[PDB]
Design a protein around this nucleic acid. Structure first.
Ligand SMILES: [Mg+2]
Ligand SMILES: [Mg+2]
Ligand SMILES: [Mg+2]
Ligand SMILES: [Mg+2]
Ligand SMILES: [Mg+2]
Ligand SMILES: [Mg+2]
Ligand SMILES: [Mg+2]
Ligand SMILES: [Mg+2]
Ligand SMILES: [Mg+2]
Ligand SMILES: [Mg+2]
Ligand SMILES: [Mg+2]
Ligand SMILES: [Mg+2]
Ligand SMILES: [Mg+2]
Ligand SMILES: [Mg+2]
Ligand SMILES: [Mg+2]
Ligand SMILES: [Mg+2]
Ligand SMILES: [Mg+2]
Ligand SMILES: [Mg+2]
Ligand SMILES: [Mg+2]
Ligand SMILES: [Mg+2]
Ligand SMILES: [Mg+2]
Ligand SMILES: [Mg+2]
Ligand SMILES: [Mg+2]
Ligand SMILES: [Mg+2]
Ligand SMILES: [Mg+2]
Ligand SMILES: [Mg+2]
Ligand SMILES: [Zn+2]
Ligand SMILES: [Zn+2]
Lengths: 91, 77, 31, 213, 112
RNA sequence: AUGGUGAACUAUGCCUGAAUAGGGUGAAGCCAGAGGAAACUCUGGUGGAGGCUCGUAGCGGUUCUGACGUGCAAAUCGAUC
RNA sequence: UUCAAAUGAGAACUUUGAAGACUGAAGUGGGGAAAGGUUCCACGUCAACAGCAGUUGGACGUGGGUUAGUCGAUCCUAAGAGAUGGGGAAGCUCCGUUUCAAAGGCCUGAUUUUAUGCAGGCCACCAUCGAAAGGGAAUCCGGUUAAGAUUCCGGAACCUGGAUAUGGAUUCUUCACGGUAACGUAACUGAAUGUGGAGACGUCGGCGCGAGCCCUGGGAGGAGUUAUCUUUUCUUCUUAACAGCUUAUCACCCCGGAAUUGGUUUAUCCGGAGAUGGGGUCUUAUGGCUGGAAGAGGCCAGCACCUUUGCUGGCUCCGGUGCGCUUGUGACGGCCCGUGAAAAUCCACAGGAAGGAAUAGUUUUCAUGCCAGGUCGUACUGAUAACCGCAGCAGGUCUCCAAGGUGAACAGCCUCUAGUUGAUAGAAUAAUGUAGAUAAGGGAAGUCGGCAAAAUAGAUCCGUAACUUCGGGAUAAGGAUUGGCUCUAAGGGUCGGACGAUCAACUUAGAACUGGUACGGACAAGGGGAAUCUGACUGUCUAAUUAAAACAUAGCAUUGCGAUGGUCAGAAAGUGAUGUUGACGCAAU
RNA sequence: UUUACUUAUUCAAUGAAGCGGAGCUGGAUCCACGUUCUAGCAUUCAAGGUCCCAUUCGGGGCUGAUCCGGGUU
């Protein structure tokens, strides 16, 4: 039983702030309140403490990450680039 | 205030060096909500704490009163 | 019960009785 | 004419930074013998939020090389750094995210952050969330390194200047609308007294040159 | 129906000015000032509450015996049993690996 | 013009404290049922979000051919808000 | 507001008694903070003051009264304030707060002896002020005064510091044993140095538990009503700090190895990184029993008297209930581009410099015993008369406790405890006023203008349009009902093997009967709708004539700056804000 | 005029700790082959080796840990 057709989590804002701004906020709020897999213990138990800080309820591991997601595309690209450079340096 | 239950410990407390005074108190109580009976509390006044020994036997209480040391100052009732 | 299928204790008891009867019937028919 | 707010802010007074809840200044280690010649290993003990700063910070504990004790440093957390991770700082440190290396020891295209402008000033460039510095190239004869800054500028700095491998965590913060004067209020309460802002046109000519009409 | 007053000159509801209502042997209600509750000591490695350690205000720990403040184990008190076990395992395994690596490095130096 | 005194009122920042009945509405997450290859849709619950709402304490001060005008008062009183 | 008596020359205003009322626990009650400074209390007493009076008084005259190791200050640090070393300034003085300083403590020594001269080492960062609401060692009960009270008196405790003895414990295996473990205990050496914890922390929501209060039964006392009735209405039946034993959500340990996935909260999380299950360990919020402690306190009865003097007997017991109120607390959940103090102080761990026993040692973190705790504040009001407003001024001024009914309710109305009965009075009832009401028929014809009044209003049910950012509009609009009485049905807990025994609460629905001119019967409480202009919204300002279309706001856009810098400050300076900052930033719009 | 230097002056940091030069020092002009699976630990003039003492509870010297500089970086 869906209670709202489109506003979803942004139903708490009522008719305020504008529809496009409410959509923009909705996307990032869903991202920031989602639950993510832990790369250490393999469980889906990682939640945001504060902006950029992501803690796993099990195994008590805290990782730095993005403001509203655990990993950003820029960070993933940087990781791949650093891996390639390290492999080139070793080889 | 402390409660003691060992009779030998009570006698040692009465013979302790700093102990000068004791009090004997008589209460009228009911055992298992039955007939009235007599309860005796012996209270030894120490320097730091007051020690209480409770005896529900009148004959044993009378025997203990007789066995109290003579230099100890006893306040009855 | 968490999903609000039973109005009260008597309804739950009647449903339990019916479910046990249906399980016994199915087991006897498959035997 | 009356003194405007732009001129008033220089005297300090009510325009100073609100620093009660800060964790401490975020700096690299002091450039010492160990970092100049080899490397030194510390451990990430916790990752914490700093009031008034978008990016999280990381507490890194090293051993004192000259005395039996522990030294705690406050680094700016790069993305991917976790609690319990080992961090290596020095000229001989490996090329891994979170390590502190001189700019001359990394290849072209390396992405770094908290980069020293001069060797030993303990971090000056690319400190805000999501920002980084790109290693464009090297000039070994002058012992220099060409880098690209977040603003797009190209700079030449010493190859002995240090930088932390990776990108500052907490990126994408400014993509969320605040929606509310209240959220802006709570944002600047932890930073300084610069909000709300009154337009100069709405003022009198005595208050601001833009006033009148 | 009996109403009470603060027994000290602080009239505000601060963290150090908390009261409860108690009936006295005189048959009347009276305020009674309650101290702030103590916090259990925490582990130095994981931050969890320490089992078997008394929970007191920090000055009160000077009045009790050493039994109430320790347990009979290495790091008893400051660290918990699971963390102590983990660091024992880590110490032994890393020392064995150091011996192995030294032997391997000596053999590689000899062969090289 | 020269030299001094004021942030006990009030303007603003900071530090450390304190205060704020009872209702209405019913967001996300979750459960059950009816559909569907899935995505997803519908029904009934649960949950208790919001610089939401009605309305006390409180804060403020819209209106009245209002009271008063050497007034209780060099800015007050009543109702309404 | 009234009656009587007393006092007095004199009484509407003083005192006591008799009456009628009020504040109605968000008080006209009981305490405090700021402020005041004796206003507190007793005796005497009326010239002036209390806009009438006065025998009265916060007035006048004379005195009495404030007792602390445990309550505060004192100590700590917060935003901040501010010397020294230095550097500016003709100078009064300014910058800066650990620098730019030779800024001060400790250990060892027969230093291979040159003969009566101090040698070898170790560790390091800055005065002071800043909270009677932050942090913090430790005290309660009963009684006592004209006025003191967690301070005095009686009894019972606790903290800190110090010297020390005995008992206990440990040792010839020297610095304890037990438990697989979680860990337990009356103890069970410890210097440098390092490390960890506590101090130490936001807000909201529901749920669980405790305490006090609320409601209620039996019994033992006391009071009231009794024209008629009521085994009746009201009231007392209490238990502090501290101490011993015991007591728990959470968490953890051992066994064991899970799909037919199970456990499980109001709220959906957990489990091969070891679930369910069985057995254990711990924190002692909190509760129970006992000591304290019935000897106290409470409620009654009976003694002699001018006694300003003494004294005796009884009872103080046993239960129940809850979406109740207040408050404390636990495990949780929601929220942030907001993640929500420091320091004094205390403890513990790692380490083992060392010291210590055989006919004798050790251990003052176990028990007991001994001594001490200075200075300053402490009365009272805290407001329609003790503060401020030129006043005993309808104004202003921070906070704690908080009963019964009706009712959703700290609303309105009535009541118990407590506290007031103060504000110049008496006699008449013209006009005009101030405040509040009613009105035949018509219903805005009044007026610049429906200004003002009236109408509506609670709860339940039926039903609810355009438009829309799809969230709203909305309680849209428009309709029906509501009392009392007598019943019926549904919704549970605790124990036992289809059910039985026992106990208890308030919600909803339905059906007869009955009064009616009224049934949210007082109180309480939206009028609604069709449109235009205008500002997005929530928010803010002209204190004392303008609350708005003005300002702010989120969103959008432009410009400057990579620190040898941008925007600013200072007379200067080895000066300062942004800056505990670094383009996802700061600054100017 | 051009090109250098440091010593005045200027800027910054630190615990003024490792700077500059050289090693018949070693491995291959460059390096210390003393530190990189792991949230352990690293502190009592440093153990060991070697010369003495007057052996006795231990005490000294060189080394461990290369040398030189008239510049804290
Ligand atoms: Mg203007
Ligand atoms: Mg002020
Ligand atoms: Mg609102
Ligand atoms: Mg409202
Ligand atoms: Mg009234
Ligand atoms: Mg009344
Ligand atoms: Mg007069
Ligand atoms: Mg008086
Ligand atoms: Mg007087
Ligand atoms: Mg100064
Ligand atoms: Mg001070
Ligand atoms: Mg305090
Ligand atoms: Mg008094
Ligand atoms: Mg006393
Ligand atoms: Mg007093
Ligand atoms: Mg008082
Ligand atoms: Mg005054
Ligand atoms: Mg004055
Ligand atoms: Mg009419
Ligand atoms: Mg007309
Ligand atoms: Mg006309
Ligand atoms: Mg409408
Ligand atoms: Mg507006
Ligand atoms: Mg005005
Ligand atoms: Mg106005
Ligand atoms: Mg505007
Ligand atoms: Zn994990
Ligand atoms: Zn632990």
């Amino acid at each position: 039983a869906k209670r709202t057709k489109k506003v979803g989590i942004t139903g708490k804002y009522g008719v305020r702030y504008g529809s496009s701004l409410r959509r923009q906020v909705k996307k990032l709020e869903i991202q920031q309140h989602a639950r993510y897999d832990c790369s250490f213990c393999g469980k889906k138990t990682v939640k945001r403490g504060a902006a950029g800080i992501w803690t796993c309820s099990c195994c008590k591991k805290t990782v730095a990450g993005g403001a509203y997601t655990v990993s950003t595309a820029a960070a993933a690209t940087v990781r791949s680039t650093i891996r390639r450079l390290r492999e080139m340096v070793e080889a | 205030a402390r409660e003691i239950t060992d009779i030998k410990q009570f006698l040692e407390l009465t013979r302790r060096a700093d102990v000068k005074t004791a009090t004997v108190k008589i209460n009228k109580k009911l055992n298992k909500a039955g007939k009235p009976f007599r309860q005796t509390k012996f209270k030894v006044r120490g320097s730091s704490s007051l020690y209480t020994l409770v005896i529900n036997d009148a004959g044993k209480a009378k025997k203990l009163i007789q066995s109290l040391p003579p230099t100890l100052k006893v306040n009855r009732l | 019960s968490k999903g609000n299928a039973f109005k009260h204790k008597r309804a739950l008891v009647e449903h339990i009785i019916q479910a046990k009867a249906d399980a016994q019937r199915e087991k006897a028919l498959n035997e | 004419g009356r003194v405007i707010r732009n001129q008033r802010k220089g005297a300090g007074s009510i325009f100073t930074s609100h620093t009660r809840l800060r964790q401490g200044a975020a700096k690299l280690r002091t450039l010492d013998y160990a970092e100049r010649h080899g490397y030194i290993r510390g451990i990430v003990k916790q990752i914490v939020h700093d009031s008034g700063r978008g990016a999280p910070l990381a507490k890194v504990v090293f051993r004192d090389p000259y005395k039996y004790r522990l030294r705690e440093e406050i680094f700016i957390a790069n993305e991917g750094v976790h609690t319990g991770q080992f961090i290596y700082a020095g000229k001989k440190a490996s090329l891994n995210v979170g390590n502190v290396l001189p700019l001359g020891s990394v290849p072209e295209g390396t992405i770094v952050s908290n980069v020293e402008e001069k060797p030993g000033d303990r971090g000056a460039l690319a400190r805000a969330s999501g920002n980084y510095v790109i290693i464009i190239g090297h000039n070994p004869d002058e012992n220099k390194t060409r880098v690209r800054l977040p603003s797009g500028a190209k700079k030449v700095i010493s190859s002995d200047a240090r930088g932390v491998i990776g990108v500052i965590a907490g990126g994408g913060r400014v993509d969320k609308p605040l929606l509310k004067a209240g959220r802006a209020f709570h944002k600047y309460r932890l930073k300084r007294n610069s909000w709300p802002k009154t337009r100069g046109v709405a003022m009198n000519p005595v208050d601001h040159p833009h006033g009148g009409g | 129906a009996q109403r009470v007053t603060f027994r000290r000159r602080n009239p505000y509801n601060t963290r150090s000015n908390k009261i409860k209502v108690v009936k006295t042997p005189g048959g009347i209600l009276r305020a009674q000032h309650v101290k702030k509750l103590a916090t259990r000591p925490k582990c130095g490695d994981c931050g969890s509450a320490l089992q078997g350690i008394s929970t007191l205000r920090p000055r009160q720990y000077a009045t009790v015996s050493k039994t109430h403040k320790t347990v009979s184990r290495a790091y008893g008190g400051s660290r918990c049993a699971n963390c102590v076990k983990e660091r024992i395992i880590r110490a032994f395994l890393i020392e064995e690996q150091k011996i192995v690596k030294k032997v391997v490095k000596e053999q590689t130096e000899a062969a090289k």
